[PDB]
Amino acid sequence: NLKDKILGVAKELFIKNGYNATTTGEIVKLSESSKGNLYYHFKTKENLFLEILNIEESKWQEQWKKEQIKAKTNREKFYLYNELSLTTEYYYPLQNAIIEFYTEYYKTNSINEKMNKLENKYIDAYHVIFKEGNLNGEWSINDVNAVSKIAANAVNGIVTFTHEQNINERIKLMNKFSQIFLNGLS
Amino acid sequence: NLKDKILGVAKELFIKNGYNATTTGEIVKLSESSKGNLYYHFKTKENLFLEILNIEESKWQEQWKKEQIKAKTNREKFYLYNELSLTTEYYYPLQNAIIEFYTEYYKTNSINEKMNKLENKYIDAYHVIFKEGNLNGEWSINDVNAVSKIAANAVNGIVTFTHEQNINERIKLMNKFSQIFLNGLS
Numbered sequence: 156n157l158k159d160k161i162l163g164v165a166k167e168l169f170i171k172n173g174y175n176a177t178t179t180g181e182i183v184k185l186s187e188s189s190k191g192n193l194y195y196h197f198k199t200k201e202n203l204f205l206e207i208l209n210i211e212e213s214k215w216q217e218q219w220k221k222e223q224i225k226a227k228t229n230r231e232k233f234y235l236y237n238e239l240s241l242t243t244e245y246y247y248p249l250q251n252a253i254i255e256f257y258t259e260y261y262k263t264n265s266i267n268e269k270m271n272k273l274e275n276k277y278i279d280a281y282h283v284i285f286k287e288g289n290l291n292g293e294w295s296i297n298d299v300n301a302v303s304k305i306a307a308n309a310v311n312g313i314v315t316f317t318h319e320q321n322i323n324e325r326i327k328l329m330n331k332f333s334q335i336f337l338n339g340l341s
Numbered sequence: 342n343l344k345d346k347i348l349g350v351a352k353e354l355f356i357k358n359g360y361n362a363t364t365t366g367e368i369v370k371l372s373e374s375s376k377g378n379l380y381y382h383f384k385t386k387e388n389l390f391l392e393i394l395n396i397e398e399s400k401w402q403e404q405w406k407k408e409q410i411k412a413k414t415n416r417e418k419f420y421l422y423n424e425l426s427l428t429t430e431y432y433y434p435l436q437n438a439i440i441e442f443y444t445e446y447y448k449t450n451s452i453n454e455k456m457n458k459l460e461n462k463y464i465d466a467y468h469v470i471f472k473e474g475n476l477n478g479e480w481s482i483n484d485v486n487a488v489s490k491i492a493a494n495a496v497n498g499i500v501t502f503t504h505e506q507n508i509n510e511r512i513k514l515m516n517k518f519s520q521i522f523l524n525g526l527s
């Protein structure tokens with residue numbers, strides 16, 4: 156595809172190399188297009204990036220839906236969502252590229268611009284879970300927005316910063332996490 | 342000393358221009374040494390950075406050892422240590438050199454022998470906190486090593502991924518976390 160097949164390119168240059176570890180010229184290579192095709196939908200490096208981000212976060216949010224089904228109590232949705240967060244091939248596989256981006260481009264309205272849209276969807280699944288937790292009364296939080304951002308990131312840390320130790324060790328830890336967190340709420 | 346001098350010039354160069362752009366030639370010139378004497382001491386840029394990384398980790402351990410008398414109980418140190426991490430990393434100079442490096446040497450097994458031992462150093466502080474909390478009966482945790490691991494990375498995510506918010510709110514979520522998390526141990 157025109158400006159669509161190009162999108163799947165950078166995605167890999169970012170997951171395979173990082174943000175400034177991949178450039179337009181680069182893209183253009185396996186891309187095979189002109190530095191104007193990008194002009195249209197992709198105004199700047201940031202855009203292309205901030206764009207691919209959300210896209211992927213969505214394939215994730217989508218898989219999450221087509222999967223939570225195997226969880227009864229919301230509390231199970233919690234443990235699960237975090238667990239799955241570990242195995243997906245979506246979004247998280249370029250959270251380091253984002254760590255960089257957070258620096259290389261923070262003297263510029265993008266963080267809260269389009270990147271604020273992501274910040275929302277990124278903590279949505281948690282928001283539901285927690286919110287619907289008050290209903291089912293599995294617990295009860297008086298600031299669901301705070302706890303939601305909290306959970307989201309911590310979990311994201313457990314996923315990002317431990318990508319070295321074997322995959323099964325990881326799954327165990329994350330579960331010992333959810334136990335503690337959920338238990339710290341009620 | 343000529344070693345320290347290298348380490349001294351090297352650090353600022355990295356702080357002034359990131360990890361990637363800083364060349365050893367620069368380091369040797371401004372340190373007034375020789376690639377020879379340099380190579381003898383560190384063998385590589387990658388390796389040089391690591392040693393600075395370690396020297397820094399030891400300076401951290403220092404601050405923590407002094408700045409922690411302001412926290413009587415282990416339950417308070419956990420609160421203090423966490424806040425401390427957020428604030429200091431808000432304006433940590435090398436912060437950008439670090440991110441470049443972790444992205445510049447992810448899969449590299451070798452650079453990961455020390456890479457981990459160092460990381461392991463930050464996890465110790467928590468480990469210490471939790472064990473002491475044990476001996477005192479502030480809580481009860483047997484798999485200290487697991488919690489310590491979870492607390493380190495959970496916090497890191499809270500600190501790293503929350504960059505879009507004002508330092509007042511951040512310190513708020515972080516203290517909220519510390520309370521919630523710490524609340525799932527008794």
Ligand SMILES: CC[n+]1c(-c2ccccc2)c2cc(N)ccc2c2ccc(N)cc21
Nearest residue numbers: 315316317318319436439440443460463497
């Ligand atoms: C947890 C290790 N760790 C730290 C770190 C955290 C606390 C103290 C010292 C270093 C880190 C710190 C910054 N700024 C940026 C990236 C990373 C990172 C990236 C990947 C990884 N696999 C472990 C990582």
